[PDB]
From Swiss-Prot, chain A:
A GO cellular-component term linked to this record: proton-transporting V-type ATPase, V0 domain
Biological processes, Gene Ontology terms: proton motive force-driven plasma membrane ATP synthesis
Gene that this polypeptide is encoded by: atpC
Keyword NAD: no
Name of the protein in question: V-type ATP synthase subunit C
From Swiss-Prot, chain B:
Protein's UniProt name: V-type ATP synthase subunit F
Keywords for this protein: ATP synthesis, Hydrogen ion transport, Ion transport, Transport
Entry's Gene Ontology molecular function annotations: ATP binding; proton-transporting ATP synthase activity, rotational mechanism; proton-transporting ATPase activity, rotational mechanism
Domain of life: Bacteria
Family label: Belongs to the V-ATPase F subunit family.
Pfam family for this entry, one: ATP-synt_F
Coiled-coil zones: none
GO biological process, one term: proton motive force-driven plasma membrane ATP synthesis
Keyword Ion transport: yes
Keyword Iron: no
Species this protein is from: Thermus thermophilus (strain ATCC 27634 / DSM 579 / HB8)
Known function: Produces ATP from ADP in the presence of a proton gradient across the membrane.
Swiss-Prot record, chain C:
GO biological process: proton motive force-driven plasma membrane ATP synthesis
Gene Ontology MF terms: ATP binding; proton-transporting ATP synthase activity, rotational mechanism; proton-transporting ATPase activity, rotational mechanism
Chain's role: Produces ATP from ADP in the presence of a proton gradient across the membrane.
Protein's UniProt name: V-type ATP synthase subunit D
Region forming the signal peptide: none
Family designation: Belongs to the V-ATPase D subunit family.
Protein source organism: Thermus thermophilus (strain ATCC 27634 / DSM 579 / HB8)
Highest taxon of the lineage: Bacteria
Keyword tRNA processing set for record: no
Keywords: ATP synthesis, Hydrogen ion transport, Ion transport, Transport
Gene designation: atpD
């Protein structure tokens, strides 16, 4: 309910993160110094042994203990405004369970990283004669999936076109739920994120030539239908046309890797602006997206430290 | 198809729609190669280099006919910085294959 | 190998290993890879090729944005494996045919 109560805890946790000199000095070592440097910080509270599954289980467990708490601890408008940040995990778990039900491989097949829902709902939500019953037992009240899966459930029971329209319905529903209340720093963020999402969808669907307007959504502002079509077909002056927007140094980029690098950098830049609002929802946004940037950069530095990769392979991926 | 290369590498193989395993332990991987010859995974097997230098051992012990598991001495991602002597591997191919130790 | 390994490491470094494992466990095994006759020197050796359907990719708008690139990378990796496979089985057959002919020449001379 109260934004300041959650914001105090989030500012305490933002007081404890990893600096730049950490990975700048962890850019050249041999994975034992990595275990050494992670023995001290707050990610070492769950580090059991040594090796790659230990480090991955430690990062996932500390992120679930340190990030998955803030969807709780408030009740009402505050949780309705803070739950729409860390909700990609629930979509990934739900589509994994959807393809597992549509495949036939057993229910203990997937690993099911934690999102925002307790896993007893997942254990109960595999056996249902009607997939509407699965969406009903999945339904916590104001949830976006609880009103999106039953929205695009109105064709069949279990298909893959259902999953594609589930993804599109999820994106437009999260954007509409951002528009449906008053947070002046989260509506613009989710609009810019879903603009990034369908832009990189158009980049990773180049060359095919299939109907783009069935894939293009609404909720972004920097792109429209004609830029989406002329970006799916191969001329990239339209990608050079985007100036004035925060897509600033991103011009003339063709391959998927440099594209997604630039999009992740501009998302973390525009999401670090959230200290502009030290009372509302901007600060917990600037905590959570900085935390996931730090987590995935820690993971990539772990991979380099273990496998002895050159630092020239990683130097471009700590640029922001 | 099937590999026994590494416990980390086989995830991208399953991501390609292709069976893959991992042991990273030589005698245990030879046992896995025995049971994988016995449950023949579509007649093509790639075995890691610094796990078994020669993949031929299990097939030359058991199945001396028809060469059904096509055995490939595949590499790993630890030595993807240098490749570990592609042309030296070809020299040992020539010497193992015709008996004659020649170079060019 | 170097390019697909770089793509896989950056893929499950930025994206989660759990979700790319789930995407791996969602893809079918793509059955139907097989081997047919090459009747060289009156001796059948099996040449191998796969099926690999390309149009029916599971969610080409994939909510992981790196499993498609890793999928194309390991597809090219498996193509490189099958090409090296049906090259080297032919090479090993020709080599054992050379040593068989050589021991027959030397045996026929030194015996009869």
């Amino acid at each position: 309910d109260d934004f300041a109560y959650l914001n105090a805890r989030v500012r305490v946790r933002r007081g404890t993160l990893l600096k730049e000199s950490f990975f700048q000095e962890a850019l050249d070592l041999s994975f034992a110094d990595f275990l050494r440097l992670l023995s001290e910080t707050v990610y070492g509270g769950e580090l059991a042994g040594q090796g790659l599954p230990d480090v991955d289980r430690a990062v996932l467990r500390t992120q679930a203990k340190l990030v998955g708490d803030l969807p709780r601890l408030v009740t009402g408008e505050a949780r309705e405004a803070v739950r729409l940040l860390l909700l990609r995990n629930d979509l990934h778990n739900l589509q994994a369970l959807l393809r597992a039900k549509a495949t036939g491989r057993p229910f203990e097949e997937v690993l099911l990283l934690p999102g925002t829902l307790r896993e007893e709902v997942w254990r109960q939500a595999y056996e249902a004669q009607d997939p509407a019953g699965m969406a009903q037992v999945l339904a916590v009240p104001g949830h976006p999936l609880a009103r999106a899966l039953r929205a695009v459930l109105r064709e069949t029971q279990d298909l893959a076109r259902v999953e594609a329209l589930l993804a599109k319905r999820f994106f437009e529903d999260v954007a509409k739920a951002a528009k449906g209340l008053d947070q002046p720093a989260l509506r613009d963020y989710l609009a810019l994120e879903v603009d990034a999402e369908n832009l990189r969808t158009a980049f990773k669907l180049q060359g095919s030539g299939l109907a783009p307007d069935a894939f293009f959504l609404k909720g972004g502002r920097f792109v429209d239908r004609v830029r989406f079509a002329r970006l799916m077909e191969g001329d990239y002056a339209v990608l050079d046309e985007l100036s004035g927007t925060p897509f600033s140094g991103l011009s003339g980029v063709r391959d998927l890797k440099a594209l997604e690098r630039g999009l992740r950098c501009v998302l973390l830049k525009e999401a670090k602006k959230g200290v502009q609002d030290p009372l509302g929802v901007g600060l917990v946004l600037a905590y959570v997206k900085e935390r996931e940037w730090e987590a995935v950069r820690l993971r990539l530095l772990a991979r380099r430290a273990y496998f002895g990769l050159p630092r020239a392979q990683v130097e471009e991926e700590v640029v922001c | 198809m099937a590999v026994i290369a590494d416990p980390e590498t086989a995830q991208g193989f399953r991501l390609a729609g292709l069976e893959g395993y991992g042991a990273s332990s030589a005698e245990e991987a030879q046992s896995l190669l025995e049971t994988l010859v016995e449950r023949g995974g579509y007649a093509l097997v790639a075995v890691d280099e610094a796990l078994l230098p020669d993949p031929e051992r299990a097939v030359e012990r058991l199945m001396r006919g028809r060469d059904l598991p096509v055995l490939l001495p595949i590499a790993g991602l630890k030595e993807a910085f240098q490749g570990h002597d592609v042309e030296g591997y070809m020299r040992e191919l020539v010497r193992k294959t015709i008996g004659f130790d020649i170079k060019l | 190998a170097k390019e697909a390994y770089a793509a896989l490491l950056l893929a499950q470094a930025f994206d989660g290993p759990e979700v790319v494992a789930g995407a791996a466990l969602g893809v079918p095994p793509l059955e139907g890879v097989e081997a047919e006759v090459e009747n060289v020197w009156g001796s059948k050796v099996p040449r191998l090729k796969a099926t690999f359907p390309d149009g029916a990719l599971l969610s080409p708008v994939g909510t992981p944005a790196y499993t498609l690139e890793a999928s194309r990378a390991f597809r090219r990796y498996a193509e490189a494996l099958i090409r090296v496979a049906n090259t080297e089985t032919r090479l090993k057959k020709i080599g054992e045919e050379i040593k068989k002919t050589t021991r027959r020449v030397n045996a026929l001379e030194q015996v009869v």
